[PDB]
Short mmCIF file of C-alpha atoms and ligand atoms in Angstrom, two decimals:
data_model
loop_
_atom_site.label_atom_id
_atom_site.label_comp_id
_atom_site.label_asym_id
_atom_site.label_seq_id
_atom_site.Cartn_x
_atom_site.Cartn_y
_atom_site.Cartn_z
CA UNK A 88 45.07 11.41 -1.74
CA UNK A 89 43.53 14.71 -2.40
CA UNK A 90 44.87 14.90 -5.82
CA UNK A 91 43.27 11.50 -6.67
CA UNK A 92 40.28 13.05 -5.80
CA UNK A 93 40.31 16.00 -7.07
CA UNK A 94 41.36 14.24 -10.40
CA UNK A 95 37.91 11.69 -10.19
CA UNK A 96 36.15 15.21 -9.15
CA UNK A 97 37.12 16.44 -12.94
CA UNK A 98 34.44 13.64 -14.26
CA UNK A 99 31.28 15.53 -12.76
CA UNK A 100 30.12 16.51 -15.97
CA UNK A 101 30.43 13.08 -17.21
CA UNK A 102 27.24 9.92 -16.71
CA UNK A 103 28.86 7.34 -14.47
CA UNK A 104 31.24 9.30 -12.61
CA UNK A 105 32.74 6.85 -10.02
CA UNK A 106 30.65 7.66 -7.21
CA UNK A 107 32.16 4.62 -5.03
CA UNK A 108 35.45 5.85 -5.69
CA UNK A 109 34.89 9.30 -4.83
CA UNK A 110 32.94 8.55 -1.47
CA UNK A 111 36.25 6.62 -0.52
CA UNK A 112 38.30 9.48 -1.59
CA UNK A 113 37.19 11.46 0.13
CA UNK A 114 36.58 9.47 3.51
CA UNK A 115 32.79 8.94 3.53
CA UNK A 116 31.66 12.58 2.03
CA UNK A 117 30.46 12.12 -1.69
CA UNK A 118 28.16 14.43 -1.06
CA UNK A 119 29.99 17.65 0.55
CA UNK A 120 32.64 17.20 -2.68
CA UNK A 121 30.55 16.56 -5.50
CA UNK A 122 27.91 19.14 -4.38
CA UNK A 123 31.02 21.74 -3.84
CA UNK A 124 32.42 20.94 -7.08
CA UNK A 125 29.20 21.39 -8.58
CA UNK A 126 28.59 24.50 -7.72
CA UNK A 127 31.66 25.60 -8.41
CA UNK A 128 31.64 24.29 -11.72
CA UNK A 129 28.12 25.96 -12.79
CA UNK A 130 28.91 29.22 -10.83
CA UNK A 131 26.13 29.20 -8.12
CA UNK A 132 28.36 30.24 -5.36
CA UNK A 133 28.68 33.83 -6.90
CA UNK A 134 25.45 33.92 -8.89
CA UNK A 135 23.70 32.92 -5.25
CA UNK A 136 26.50 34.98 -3.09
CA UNK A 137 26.77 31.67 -0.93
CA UNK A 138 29.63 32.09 1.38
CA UNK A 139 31.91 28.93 1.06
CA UNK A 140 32.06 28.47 4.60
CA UNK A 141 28.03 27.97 4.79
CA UNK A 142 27.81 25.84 1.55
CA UNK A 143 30.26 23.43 3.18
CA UNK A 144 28.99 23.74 6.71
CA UNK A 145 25.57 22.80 5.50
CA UNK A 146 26.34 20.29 3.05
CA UNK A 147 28.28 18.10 5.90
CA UNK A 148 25.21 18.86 8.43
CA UNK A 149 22.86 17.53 5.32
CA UNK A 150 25.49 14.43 4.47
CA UNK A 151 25.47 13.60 8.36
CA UNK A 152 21.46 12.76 8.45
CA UNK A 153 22.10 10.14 5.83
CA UNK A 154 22.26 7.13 7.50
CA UNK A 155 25.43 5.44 6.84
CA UNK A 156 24.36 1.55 8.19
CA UNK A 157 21.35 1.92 5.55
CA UNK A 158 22.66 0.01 2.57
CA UNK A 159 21.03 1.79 -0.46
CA UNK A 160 19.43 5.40 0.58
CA UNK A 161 22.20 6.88 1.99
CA UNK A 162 24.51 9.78 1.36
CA UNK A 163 26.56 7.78 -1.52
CA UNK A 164 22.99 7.87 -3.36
CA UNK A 165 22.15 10.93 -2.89
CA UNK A 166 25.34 11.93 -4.34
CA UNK A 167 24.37 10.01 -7.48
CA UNK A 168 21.42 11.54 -7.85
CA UNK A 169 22.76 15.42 -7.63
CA UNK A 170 25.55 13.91 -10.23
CA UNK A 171 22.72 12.51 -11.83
CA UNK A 172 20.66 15.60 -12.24
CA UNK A 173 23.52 17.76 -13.14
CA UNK A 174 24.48 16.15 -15.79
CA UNK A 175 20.74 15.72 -17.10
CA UNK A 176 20.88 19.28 -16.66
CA UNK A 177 23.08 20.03 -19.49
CA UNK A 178 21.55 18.55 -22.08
CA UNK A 179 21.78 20.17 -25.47
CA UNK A 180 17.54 20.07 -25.90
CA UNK A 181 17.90 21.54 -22.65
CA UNK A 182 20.01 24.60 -22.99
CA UNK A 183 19.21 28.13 -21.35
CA UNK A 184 15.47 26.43 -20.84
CA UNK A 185 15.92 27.06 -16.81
CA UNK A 186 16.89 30.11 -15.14
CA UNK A 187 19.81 30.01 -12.56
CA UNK A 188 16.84 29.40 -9.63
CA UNK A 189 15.40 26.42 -11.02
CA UNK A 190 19.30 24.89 -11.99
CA UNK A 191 19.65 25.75 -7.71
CA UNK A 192 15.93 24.06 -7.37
CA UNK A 193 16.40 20.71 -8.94
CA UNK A 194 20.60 20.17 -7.69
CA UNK A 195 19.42 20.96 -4.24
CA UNK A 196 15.82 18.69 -4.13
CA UNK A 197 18.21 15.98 -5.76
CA UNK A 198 20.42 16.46 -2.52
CA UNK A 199 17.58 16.04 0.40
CA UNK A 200 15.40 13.98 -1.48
CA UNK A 201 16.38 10.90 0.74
CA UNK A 202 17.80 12.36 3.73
CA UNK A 203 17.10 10.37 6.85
CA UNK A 204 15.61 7.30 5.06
CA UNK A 205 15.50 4.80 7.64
CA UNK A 206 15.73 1.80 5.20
CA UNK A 207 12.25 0.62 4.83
CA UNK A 208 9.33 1.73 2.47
CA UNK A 209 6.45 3.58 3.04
CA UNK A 210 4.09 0.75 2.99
CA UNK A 211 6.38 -1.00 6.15
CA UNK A 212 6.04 2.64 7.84
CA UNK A 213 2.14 2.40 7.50
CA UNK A 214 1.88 -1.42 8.24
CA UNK A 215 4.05 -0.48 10.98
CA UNK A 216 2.08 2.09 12.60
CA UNK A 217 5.63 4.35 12.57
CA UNK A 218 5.45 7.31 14.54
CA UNK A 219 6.43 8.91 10.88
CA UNK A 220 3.46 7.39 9.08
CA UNK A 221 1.33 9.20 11.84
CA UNK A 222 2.57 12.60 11.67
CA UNK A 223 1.86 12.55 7.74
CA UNK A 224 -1.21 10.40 7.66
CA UNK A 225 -0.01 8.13 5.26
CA UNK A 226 0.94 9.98 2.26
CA UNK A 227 4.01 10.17 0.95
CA UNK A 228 5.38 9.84 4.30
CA UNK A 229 9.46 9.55 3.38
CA UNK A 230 9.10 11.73 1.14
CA UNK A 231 7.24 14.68 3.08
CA UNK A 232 10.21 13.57 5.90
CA UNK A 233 13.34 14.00 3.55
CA UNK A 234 11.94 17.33 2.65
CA UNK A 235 11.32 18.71 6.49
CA UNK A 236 14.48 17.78 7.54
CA UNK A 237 16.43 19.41 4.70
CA UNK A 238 14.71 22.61 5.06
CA UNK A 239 15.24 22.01 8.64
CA UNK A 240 18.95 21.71 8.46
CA UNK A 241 19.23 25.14 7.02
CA UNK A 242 18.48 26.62 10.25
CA UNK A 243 21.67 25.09 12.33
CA UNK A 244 24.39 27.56 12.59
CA UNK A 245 26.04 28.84 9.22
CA UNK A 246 24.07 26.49 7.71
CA UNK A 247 21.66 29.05 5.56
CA UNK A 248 22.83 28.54 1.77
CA UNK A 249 19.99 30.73 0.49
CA UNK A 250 20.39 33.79 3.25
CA UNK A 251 21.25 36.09 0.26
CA UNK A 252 18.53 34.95 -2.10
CA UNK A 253 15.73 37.70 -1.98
CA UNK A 254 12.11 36.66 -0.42
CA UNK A 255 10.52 35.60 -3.36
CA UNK A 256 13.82 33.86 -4.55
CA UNK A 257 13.09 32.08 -1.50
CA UNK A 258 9.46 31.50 -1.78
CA UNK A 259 9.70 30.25 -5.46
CA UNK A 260 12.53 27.97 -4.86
CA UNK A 261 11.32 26.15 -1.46
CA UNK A 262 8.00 25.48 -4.01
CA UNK A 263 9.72 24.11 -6.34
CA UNK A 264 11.96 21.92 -4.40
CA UNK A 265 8.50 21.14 -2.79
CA UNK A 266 6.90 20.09 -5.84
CA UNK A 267 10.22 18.17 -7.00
CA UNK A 268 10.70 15.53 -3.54
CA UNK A 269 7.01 14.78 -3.26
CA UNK A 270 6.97 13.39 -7.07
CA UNK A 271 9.95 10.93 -6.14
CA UNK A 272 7.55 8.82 -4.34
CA UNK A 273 7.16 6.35 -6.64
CA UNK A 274 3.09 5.51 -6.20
CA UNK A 275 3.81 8.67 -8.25
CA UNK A 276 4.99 7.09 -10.93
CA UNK A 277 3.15 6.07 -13.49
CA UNK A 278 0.89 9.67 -13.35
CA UNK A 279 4.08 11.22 -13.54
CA UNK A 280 5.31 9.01 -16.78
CA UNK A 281 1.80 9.42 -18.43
CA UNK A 282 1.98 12.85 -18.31
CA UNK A 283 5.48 12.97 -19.66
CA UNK A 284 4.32 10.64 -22.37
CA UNK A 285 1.67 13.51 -23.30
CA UNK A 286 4.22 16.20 -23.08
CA UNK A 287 6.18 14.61 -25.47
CA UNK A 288 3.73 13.91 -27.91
CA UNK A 289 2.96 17.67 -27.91
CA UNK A 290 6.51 18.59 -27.71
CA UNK A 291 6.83 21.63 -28.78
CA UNK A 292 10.77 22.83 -29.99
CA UNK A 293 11.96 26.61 -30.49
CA UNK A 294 13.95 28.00 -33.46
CA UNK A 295 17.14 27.26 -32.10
CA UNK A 296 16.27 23.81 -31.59
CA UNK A 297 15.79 23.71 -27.78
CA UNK A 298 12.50 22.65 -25.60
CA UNK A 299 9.83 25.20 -25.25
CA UNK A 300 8.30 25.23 -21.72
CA UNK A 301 5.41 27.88 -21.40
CA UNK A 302 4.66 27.89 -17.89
CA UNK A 303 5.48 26.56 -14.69
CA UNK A 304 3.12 23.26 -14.96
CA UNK A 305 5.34 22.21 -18.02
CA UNK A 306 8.82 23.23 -16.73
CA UNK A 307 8.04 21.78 -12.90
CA UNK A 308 6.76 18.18 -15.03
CA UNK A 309 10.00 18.09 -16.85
CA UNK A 310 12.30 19.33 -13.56
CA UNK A 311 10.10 16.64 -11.32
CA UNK A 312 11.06 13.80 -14.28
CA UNK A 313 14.29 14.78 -14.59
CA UNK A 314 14.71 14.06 -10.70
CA UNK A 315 12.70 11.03 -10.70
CA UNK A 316 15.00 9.81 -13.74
CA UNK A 317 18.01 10.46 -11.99
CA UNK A 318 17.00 8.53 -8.74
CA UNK A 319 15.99 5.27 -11.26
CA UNK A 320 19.33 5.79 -13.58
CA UNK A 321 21.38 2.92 -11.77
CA UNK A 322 20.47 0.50 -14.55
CA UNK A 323 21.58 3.12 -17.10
CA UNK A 324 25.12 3.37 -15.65
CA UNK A 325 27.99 1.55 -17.08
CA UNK A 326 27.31 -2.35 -15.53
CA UNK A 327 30.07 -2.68 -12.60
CA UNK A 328 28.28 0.60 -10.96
CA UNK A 329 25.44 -1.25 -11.53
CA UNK A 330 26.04 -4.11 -10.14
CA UNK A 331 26.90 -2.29 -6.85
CA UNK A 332 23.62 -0.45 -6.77
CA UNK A 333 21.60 -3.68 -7.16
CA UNK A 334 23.68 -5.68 -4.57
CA UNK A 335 23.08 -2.69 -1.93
CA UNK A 336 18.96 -2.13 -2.86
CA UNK A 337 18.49 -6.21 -2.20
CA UNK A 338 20.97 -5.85 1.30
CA UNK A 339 18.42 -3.16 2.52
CA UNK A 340 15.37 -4.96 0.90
CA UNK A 341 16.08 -8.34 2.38
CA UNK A 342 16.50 -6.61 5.82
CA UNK A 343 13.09 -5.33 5.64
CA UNK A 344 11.78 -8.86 4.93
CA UNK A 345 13.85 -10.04 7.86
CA UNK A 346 11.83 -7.36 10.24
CA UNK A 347 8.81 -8.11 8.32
CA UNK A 348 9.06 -11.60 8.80
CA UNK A 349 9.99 -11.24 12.39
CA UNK A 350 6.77 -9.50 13.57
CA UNK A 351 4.56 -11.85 11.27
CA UNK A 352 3.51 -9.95 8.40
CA UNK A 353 3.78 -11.01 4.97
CA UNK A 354 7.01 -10.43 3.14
CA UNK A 355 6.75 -7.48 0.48
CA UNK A 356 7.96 -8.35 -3.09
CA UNK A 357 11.92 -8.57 -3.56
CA UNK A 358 12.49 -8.60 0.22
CA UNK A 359 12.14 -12.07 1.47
CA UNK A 360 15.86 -13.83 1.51
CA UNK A 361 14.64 -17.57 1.05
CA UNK A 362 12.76 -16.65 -2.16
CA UNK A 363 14.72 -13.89 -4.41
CA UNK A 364 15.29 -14.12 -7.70
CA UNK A 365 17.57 -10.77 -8.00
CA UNK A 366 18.63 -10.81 -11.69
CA UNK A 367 14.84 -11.76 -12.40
CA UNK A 368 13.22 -8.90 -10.73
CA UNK A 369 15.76 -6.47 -12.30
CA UNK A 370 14.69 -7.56 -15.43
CA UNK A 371 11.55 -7.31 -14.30
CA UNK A 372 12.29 -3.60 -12.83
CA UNK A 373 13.74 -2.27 -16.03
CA UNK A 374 11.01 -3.64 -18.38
CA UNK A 375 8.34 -2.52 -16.49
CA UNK A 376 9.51 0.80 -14.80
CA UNK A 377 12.54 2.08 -15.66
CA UNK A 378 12.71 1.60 -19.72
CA UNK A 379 9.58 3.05 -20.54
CA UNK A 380 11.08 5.70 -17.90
CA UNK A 381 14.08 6.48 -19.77
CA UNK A 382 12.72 5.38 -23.19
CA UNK A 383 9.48 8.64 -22.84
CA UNK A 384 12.97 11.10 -21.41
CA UNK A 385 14.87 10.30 -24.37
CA UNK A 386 12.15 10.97 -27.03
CA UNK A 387 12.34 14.33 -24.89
CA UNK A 388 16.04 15.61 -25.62
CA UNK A 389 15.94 13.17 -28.91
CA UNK A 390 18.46 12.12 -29.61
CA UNK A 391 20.18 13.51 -26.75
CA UNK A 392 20.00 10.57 -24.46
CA UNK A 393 20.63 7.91 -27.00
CA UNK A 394 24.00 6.49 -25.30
CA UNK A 395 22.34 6.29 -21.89
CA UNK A 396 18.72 4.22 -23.03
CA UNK A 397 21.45 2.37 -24.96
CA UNK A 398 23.62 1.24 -22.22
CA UNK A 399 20.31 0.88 -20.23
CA UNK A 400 19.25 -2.05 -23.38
CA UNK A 401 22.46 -4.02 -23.11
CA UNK A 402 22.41 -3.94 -18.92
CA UNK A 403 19.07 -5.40 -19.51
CA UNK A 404 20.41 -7.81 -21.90
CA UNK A 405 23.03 -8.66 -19.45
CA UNK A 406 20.86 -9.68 -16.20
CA UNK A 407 18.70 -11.65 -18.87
CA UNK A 408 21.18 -13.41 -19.88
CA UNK A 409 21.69 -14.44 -16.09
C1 0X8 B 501 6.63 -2.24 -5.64
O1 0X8 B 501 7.18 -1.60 -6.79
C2 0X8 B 501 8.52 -1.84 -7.01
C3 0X8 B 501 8.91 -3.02 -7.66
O2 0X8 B 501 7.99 -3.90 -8.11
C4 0X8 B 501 10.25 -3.30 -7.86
C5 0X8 B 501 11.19 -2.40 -7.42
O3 0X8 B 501 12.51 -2.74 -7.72
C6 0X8 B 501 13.54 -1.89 -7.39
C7 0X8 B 501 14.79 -2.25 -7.86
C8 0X8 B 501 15.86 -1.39 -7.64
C9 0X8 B 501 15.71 -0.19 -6.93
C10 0X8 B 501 14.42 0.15 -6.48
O4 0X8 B 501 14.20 1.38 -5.87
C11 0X8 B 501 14.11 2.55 -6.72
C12 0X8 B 501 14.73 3.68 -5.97
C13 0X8 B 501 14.15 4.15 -4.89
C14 0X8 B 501 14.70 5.25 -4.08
O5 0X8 B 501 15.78 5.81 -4.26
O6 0X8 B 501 13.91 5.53 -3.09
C15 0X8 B 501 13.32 -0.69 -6.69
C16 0X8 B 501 11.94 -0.31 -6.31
O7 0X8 B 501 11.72 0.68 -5.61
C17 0X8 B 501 10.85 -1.20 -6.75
C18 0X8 B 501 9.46 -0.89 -6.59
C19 0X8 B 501 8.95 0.42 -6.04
C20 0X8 B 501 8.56 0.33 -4.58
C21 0X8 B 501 7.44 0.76 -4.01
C22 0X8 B 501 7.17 0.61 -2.54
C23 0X8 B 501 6.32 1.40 -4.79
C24 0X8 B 501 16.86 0.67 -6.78
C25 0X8 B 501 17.98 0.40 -7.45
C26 0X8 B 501 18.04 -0.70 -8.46
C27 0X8 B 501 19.41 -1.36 -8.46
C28 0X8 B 501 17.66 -0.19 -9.85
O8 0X8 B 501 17.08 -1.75 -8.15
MG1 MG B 502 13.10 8.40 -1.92
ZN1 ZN B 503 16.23 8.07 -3.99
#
């Protein structure tokens, strides 16, 4: 069994990796592997002098505060999204652009940036008067959580990855990672694609070919992007992962229309049970978020990306056709 995995680990570097398979694999821990392999594969372990013990020890504390009886944001997606990001990472437009600390920055925000997601949205949490809502006052209330706790987490025992990073190693990366969670909240979103839209339309390319990125505002934009595409890149993903992803977003949806309806508030959009329309409002999803999404990152690492926003047009095409 550990051969099968370790042959379906050799895809990491490939989009659409079978995550599913993987988290089965290897008995419920997509993350712990694919993270390990990961760093193996780009070298952070020695670059980082992270002692294998802690990397592991700290990767299964982090997988364990993902809820497994949450349908979509649990440690199977947050697998997905490291995957995600690494392989968004390696981009050809994108190649010695990031130093070894901001590679570390964006792999390990991609790995807390749902931890402990309860299963409902931040508008339930406020609606709900959540204890959670009222410790961060309303504002990007998940997403200021996911981030305390995986911080948190690093102080259980052996569980400090970055204990050989020096202070302002430290310092710049927890920014960073900082700056990367709080723009997955997705009433982020479309200040986040306009100013990717205006980045590209200044794009600005060196001799060898590769994205110029000046200062930290521009190379934070396109590490917070990169992030926020990789937690929306279901619908680019070849269709039977797809289809998983969508049938596990509407289980956890329609169970917060269930509580919603229960306690007499109105039913948000896509959650009430006796009036979905699920290939509809993925239809409705891509056209409206997640294409122009991908569509602005492509025109980034043109033509880089052109088999992804492809397979993203004919998934579209498919639910349509539904
Ligand atoms: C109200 O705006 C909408 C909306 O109008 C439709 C939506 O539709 C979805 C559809 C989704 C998924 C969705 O989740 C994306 C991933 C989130 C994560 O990892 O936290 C959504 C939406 O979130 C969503 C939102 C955004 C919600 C809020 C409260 C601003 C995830 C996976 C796939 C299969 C792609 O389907
Ligand atoms: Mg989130
Ligand atoms: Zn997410």
């Amino acid at each position: 069994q550990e051969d099968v995995l370790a042959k379906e680990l050799e895809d990491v570097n490939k989009w659409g990796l079978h995550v599913f398979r993987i988290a089965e694999l290897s008995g419920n821990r997509p993350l712990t592997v694919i993270m390990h392999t990961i760093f193996q594969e780009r070298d952070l372990l020695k670059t980082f002098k992270i002692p294998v013990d802690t990397l592991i020890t700290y990767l299964m504390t982090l997988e364990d505060h993902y809820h497994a009886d949450v349908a979509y944001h649990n440690n199977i997606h947050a697998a997905d999204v490291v995957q995600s990001t690494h392989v968004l990472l390696s981009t050809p437009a994108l190649e010695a652009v990031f130093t070894d600390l901001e590679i570390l920055a964006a792999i390990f925000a991609s790995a807390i940036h749902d931890v402990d997601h309860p299963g409902v949205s931040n508008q339930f949490l406020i609606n709900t008067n959540s204890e959670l809502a009222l410790m961060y006052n309303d504002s990007s209330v998940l997403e200021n959580h996911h981030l305390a706790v995986g911080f948190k987490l690093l102080q259980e025992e052996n569980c400090d990855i970055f204990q050989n990073l020096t202070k302002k190693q430290r310092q710049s990366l927890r920014k960073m990672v900082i700056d990367i969670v709080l723009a997955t909240d997705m009433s982020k979103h479309m200040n986040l694609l306009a100013d990717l839209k205006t980045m590209v339309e200044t794009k600005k390319v060196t001799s060898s070919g590769v994205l110029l990125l000046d200062n930290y505002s521009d190379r934070i934009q396109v590490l917070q992007n990169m992030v926020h595409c990789a937690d929306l890149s279901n619908p680019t993903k070849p269709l039977q992962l797809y289809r998983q992803w969508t049938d596990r977003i509407m289980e956890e949806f329609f169970r917060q229309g269930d509580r919603e309806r229960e306690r007499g508030m109105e039913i948000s959009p896509m959650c009430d049970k006796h009036n979905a329309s699920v290939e509809k409002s993925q239809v409705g999803f891509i056209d409206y978020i997640v294409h122009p999404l991908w569509e602005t990152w492509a025109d980034l690492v043109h033509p880089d990306a052109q088999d992804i926003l492809d397979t993203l047009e004919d998934n579209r095409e498919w639910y349509q056709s539904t």
